[PDB]
């Protein structure tokens, strides 16, 4: 059966960052696990926020708040900046 992951996207990001560096299979699996784990943490926190405020819709504002709760210190500012930039560009075009 067809099983999916984030391998191709992680590889594209790698070729954007270090243009001539490869990555082994075990490391690739590790980073797949990392992306899944972070995704699930953020989504769970956003879900709990939305239920907390008796709303029934996860929006970019709940995602932003969950990011600010989970990520530590200087990481949070850059993360929210990247998210805001992406959403702004998406809506503008």
């Amino acid at each position: 059966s067809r099983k999916e992951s984030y391998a191709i996207y992680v590889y594209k990001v790698l070729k954007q960052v270090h243009p001539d560096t490869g990555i082994s299979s075990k490391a690739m699996s590790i980073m797949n696990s990392f992306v899944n784990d972070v995704f699930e943490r953020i989504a769970g926190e956003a879900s709990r926020l939305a239920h907390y405020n008796k709303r029934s819709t996860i929006t970019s504002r709940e995602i932003q708040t969950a990011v600010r709760l989970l990520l530590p210190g200087e990481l949070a500012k850059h993360a929210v900046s990247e998210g805001t930039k992406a959403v702004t560009k998406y809506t503008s075009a």
């Binding site: 907390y52 405020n53 504002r61 709940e62 708040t65 600010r68 709760l69």
Partner: protein, 88 residues
């Protein structure tokens, strides 16, 4: 004269007095206490409170409020893995 400026020295963290810290240690079961424990304890408490209050304020500000509520504090604690019973 020159008495209106004789008391400007609160420094709120000093509000956690030496006897209070000693009482806390006694409840913890400590028989004898060094003299440097007080400043160290004040630092530890300040860090703990900063973390909890940051989380509670984030929850509150997300909810478009201006009043930190007992529920917000409870959820901050629970998010830090310190569940608290008795405040709803």
């Amino acid at each position: 004269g020159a008495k209106r400026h004789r008391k400007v020295l609160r420094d709120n963290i000093q509000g956690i007095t030496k006897p209070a810290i000693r009482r806390l240690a006694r409840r913890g079961g400590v028989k004898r206490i060094s003299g440097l424990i007080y400043e160290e304890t004040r630092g530890v408490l300040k860090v703990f409170l900063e973390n909890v209050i940051r989380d509670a304020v984030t929850y509150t500000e997300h909810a478009k409020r201006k009043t930190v509520t007992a529920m917000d504090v409870v959820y901050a604690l629970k998010r830090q893995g310190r569940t608290l019973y008795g405040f709803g």
